[PDB]
Structure 1
């Protein structure tokens, strides 16, 4: 039912309408390509405002009702896991291939034949990248050059003023949670937090877990060096419910009786802490003045009002268990850590619980500081691609010169190999060459230079001057040859860019009809 007022769009006009939808998303994002990319203003539905030039953040907030655009947005969920930084390179390359395809549809070529040529040209280009690539840490694991690559990555963000410090912590973090020989770095083990105040130079690495929760009392010991941590659901006091106790005291006859039973539970459980051997007792709820008065006499620090997911992470990081009640305590359910400190922030009373391991760990949290929350927000994503830059180099130290050098070199190989394909896919291979040029031609445009003159000037330099590829000086540095500028992109990233771009073009080309029923 509901055939009446059903939206429909079919025929060759639909394919050109689908291409027009993808070009709108590519032309929107090609301006934000490169370090000199133009930002994008976001107007949140709740009245909030932010500014950023991140390709992934633009696609996430872009509310597009067109179905072809939603597929292009879904590619970001698969691309950011591998590359992280240049999701724009896939959308710009996808929209470029679709624009050049529109010239081939007029010639009378089927869309599937166009997709067959791009898949053939992608293997030509992907094969070319494996040749001109270069290694950094071949056969030895080292930390000197690996830190330098991340320092150029954060320079593209607002945190460029403090890009040199965060790169060292990024290498120790990934090397801590996983070994380079294992080649298995998990982002789930990595967490990033922060708070307003200070500067980005105060970024620190905490091997363990950090939660914005304070001790049960300021008179508690500020250092739990021994590795015995109890993690209960209730505090060591008379048991209370989750919402409200509502004790019924009619007169003094009940007060002196219940106070004895209550005081007995105060002494029984507070002394049970040293029975099981636990020094620190982390609890979901807070402690009463009678409890903290007894904790101080026993030198038993404890944490109050710890959150739901915070109690879970402390058990995982310290290696303990979420104890449901004190009766289930045991030597095995006590957590492990080397030093527990309470770290305040100037005049603010945050006092986050800092659980240090005093050794190499398997999970590490990243604490960020700064004078603005949105700059701290953009600072968090600035490390996410750095984790991918480090993770990509760990999976394969082989890399290709960025700044558009790879795209211009592949375009020459794709163009020459097109002569060897006597079939209608030849026009698509030449279209793949011109589409590859849009990434570097977009960088020069965003920097304020003549695109085509800077494009072809680097082509002849890549053909006449020398065989090693040369990029575009978009930062207005001395000259080309980005190897001197140390602007190098990963090999797995460039291969996933051309791969995800060809897939996204293949999916949109094999679609030729959209149907949806309207409001009856």
Structure 2
């Protein structure tokens, strides 16, 4: 095993980084082609995600593992945009290896990129807008939803799900001192109806998964009840079976269970209880008998789900079975069964709560890819509305911000000791790769369009000119209602700079050769 001494290790690392970034450079923008993925079995899927593809990627390099780890660790604050950072890092590494061939230490360019990103952020902070009120975030809601979603899962537009997701965040933002929590909103998915049947569960919705839909089931309840005492023969987290060396003990236990059913129904009828949910259960035979004899009630409520049952009512619990009354329970409002299919199981939706801590959305589908794309669009909308309510500052997209930053870097670079201008010119030219790739992904020439838009931006003012991927009329940005958050761009730039610095810092020798 020989040791890589000299400049071959850096060249190999840059080549590996470029070969890795070439995979993400092809799929860029909404006009990207569907990328396929197949595992060991015969499961072949198609999608376009910068995080799903990088997760199931197999590499044989030490730098690729750190790269994909840094790419996956930063995705909760930007949402959509984990593909351009790789291309930016690849272009920066290519410029670094091009400028290093003349005999320049990587420390100089690594320190210059810091001030380059600093001045880029300083220039981007002054070119934005701050005139958003209670109308600028409510009237263009349909335009923002159309720009976020697009036309990938459904050709027509969708206004119900967008308004539902907006209200689900508006009912929690201003209520908890302009703050929102990720654990408060949940995403649920189940096949059934169509995509337009979007429901907003104000309370909590719980499924039961029945076994036989032909069993007579009639709804007739009006008050919920929570208990901790064993309402029925419980299961102490142990798979019970025929562990009795007798034959009459089975009939004895059946008679005892019938007597217990009779006693329980007489107590809930003499005190005023109804659907009492505990934290234990039994087999399916007991539930079948309880549904066949009289009174509809289904057990099987084991697990942490009882926690939500301790929060969707309003009160406390009982430590002993011999401590029950008409005031220690909890009153309800409308607790019944809901089943839109009328052929499957039932669902319970709590419509009585003093706070909003489990608001969720319910979207029906018909396959596996459409529901996944719908949930991805919903997550992206939630992320963008969180970024909007966190800071009322946005910026125009398309590809004008990169050109403006490059122009500002090229302009504010008159004085230079011996490396400042070199670093600023090696960092500015690497920013014009995103619009070039976006224009090359379509059926137009990227070089000519980029030169034309740069000339148009440098001739007159109003830096709001870019390219169009939908083939429309003019190349304006304020007319297509396209917008992009600035915090996400700042985070992406910071992550790219940190990754470039970490790559340019660790490059000495390697132990396994």
Q: Give 3-state SS (helix, strand or coil) of 2:379's partner.
A: helix
For 1:221 and 1:420, the matched residues in 2 are separated by 86
Deviation digits for residues 298-335 of structure 1, max 9, x if unmatched?
99764543463544455456667899996798999978
**Contact 1:223–1:340, Cα closer than 8 Å, also in 2:** no
Unpaired segments ≥5 residues, structure 1 = 1-5
Cα displacement (A) at 1:391:
0.6
Secondary structure of 1:45's counterpart equals: coil
Moved more, 352-361 or 402-411: 352-361
- Kept in 1, the 8 Å contact 2:172–2:179? The answer is no
Deviates more, 1:235-244 or 1:52-61: 235-244
> Greater strand percent: which structure?
1
Aligned to 2:182: 187
- State the distance in 1 between where 2:39 and 2:320 align: 44
Contact persistence 1:42–1:50 (CA under 8 A): yes
Between the aligned partners of 1:330 and 1:37, the Cα distance in structure 2 is 65
**Offset, 1:22:** 2.0
Report the counterpart of residue 255 of structure 1 in structure 2. 250
Q: Alpha carbons of 1:132 and 1:339: their partners in 2 closer, same or farther (altered >3 Å)?
A: farther
Aligned to 1:68: 63
SS in structure 2 at match of 1:389: helix
Structure 1's 200 and 264: CA in aligned 2 closer, same or farther, altered over 3 A?
Answer: same
Distance 1:337 1:38 in 2: 52
Q: Does the 8 Å CA contact 2:123/2:408 hold for their aligned counterparts?
A: yes
The answer to whether the aligner puts 1:408 opposite 2:414 as a matched pair is: no
Residues 508, 252 of structure 1: alpha-carbon distance in 2 compared, 3 angstrom cutoff: closer
User: By how many angstroms is 1:336 displaced?
Assistant: 8.3
How far has the Cα of 1:88 moved from its partner? 1.1
Shift of the alpha carbon at 1:75? Answer: 2.7
RMSD (Å) for aligned C-alpha atoms: 3.9
CA contact (8 A) 1:408 1:459 kept: yes
Structure 2, unpaired ranges of 5+? none
Instruction: Please identify, of 229-238 and 30-39, the stretch whose mean Cα deviation from structure 2 is larger.
Output: 229-238
Q: Is the 8 A contact 1:213 1:352 kept in 2?
A: yes
Which range moved further: 354-363 or 448-457? 354-363
State TM-score, norm by structure 2. 0.85
Task: Give the SS at the match of 2:484.
Answer: strand
1:512 CA drift (Å): 0.6
3-state SS of paired residue (1:217)? coil
Would you say 1:318 and 2:308 are equivalent positions? no
Higher helix proportion: 1
In 1, are the aligned partners of 2:229 and 2:318 still within 8 Å (CA)? no
Per-residue deviation, 1:498: 1.0
Give the CA deviation at 1:449: 1.4
Q: Are the aligned partners of 2:149 and 2:377 in contact in 1 as well (CA < 8 Å)?
A: yes
How far did 1:153 drift? 0.6
Contact 2:235 2:281 in 1 (8 A): no
Q: Does residue 456 of structure 1 match 2:448?
A: no
Given that residues 471 and 481 in structure 1 are in contact (C-alpha distance below 8 angstroms), is that contact kept between their aligned partners in structure 2? Answer: yes
1:22-74 deviations in Å (ceiling 9; x for gaps):
22232211222111122211113443222111212222222323221222222
* Deviation string, structure 1 residues 386-445 (Cα, Å, up to 9, x no partner): 111101111112101011121111111111123334331322211221111111111111
> Quick one: structure 1 residues 43 and 290, their matched pair in 2 at CA, closer, same or farther if it must change by over 3 Å?
closer
Deviation digits for residues 133-155 of structure 1 (CA, Å, limit 9, x no counterpart): 12363477953334531331111
- Distance of 1:472 and 1:300 partners within structure 2: 67
Aligned residues of 1:195 and 1:373 also touching (Cα < 8 A): no
Mapped to 2, the partners of 1:331 and 1:17 lie a distance apart of 77
Q: Bigger CA drift: 226-235 or 239-248? A: 226-235
CA–CA distance in structure 1, aligned partners of residues 479 and 140 of structure 2: 14
Deviations 1:472-496 (A, max 9, x none): 1112122212221111100101111
What whole-Å deviation, never above 9, does each CA across 1:320-371 have from its counterpart, x for those lacking one?
7899996798999978875445443537524344334478723222222122
Residue-pair matches, total:
513
Check whether the contact 2:146–2:157 (CA below 8 A) recurs between aligned residues: no
| Greater Cα offset, 86-95 or 349-358 | 349-358
SS at match of 2:407: helix
Change (3 A) 1:26 1:293: closer
Q: Which is further off, 274-283 or 466-475?
A: 274-283
- How big is each residue's C-alpha offset from its partner over 1:246-291, in whole Å with a ceiling of 9 and x where there is no partner? 4678889756754553333223444555788654333566677996
Contact 1:233 1:284 in 2 (8 A): yes
Which deviates more from structure 2 when the two are superposed, residues 452-461 or residues 333-342?
333-342
Q: Is the 1:208–1:318 contact (alpha carbons within 8 Å) kept by the matching residues of 2?
A: no
**SS of residue in 2 equivalent to 1:208:** coil
How far does residue 17 in structure 1 lie from its aligned partner after superposition?
Answer: 1.9
DSSP 3-state at the match of 2:175: coil
Q: More deviation in 66-75 or 303-312?
A: 303-312
Match of residue 475 from structure 2 = 480
Deviates more, 1:268-277 or 1:65-74: 268-277
Q: Indicate conservation of the 8 Å contact 1:194/1:367, yes or no.
A: yes
Cα shift readout 1:155-174 (whole Å, capped 9, x = no counterpart): 16424545433211111122
Kept after mapping to 1: 8 A contact 2:202/2:360: yes
Does the 8 Å CA contact 2:221/2:336 hold for their aligned counterparts? Answer: no
Q: Distance in 2 between matches of 1:307 and 1:160?
A: 43
Given that 1:143 and 1:171 are in contact with CA atoms closer than 8 Å, whether structure 2 keeps it comes out as no
Pair 1:207-2:205 in alignment: no
8 Å CA contact 2:203–2:351 kept in 1: the answer is yes
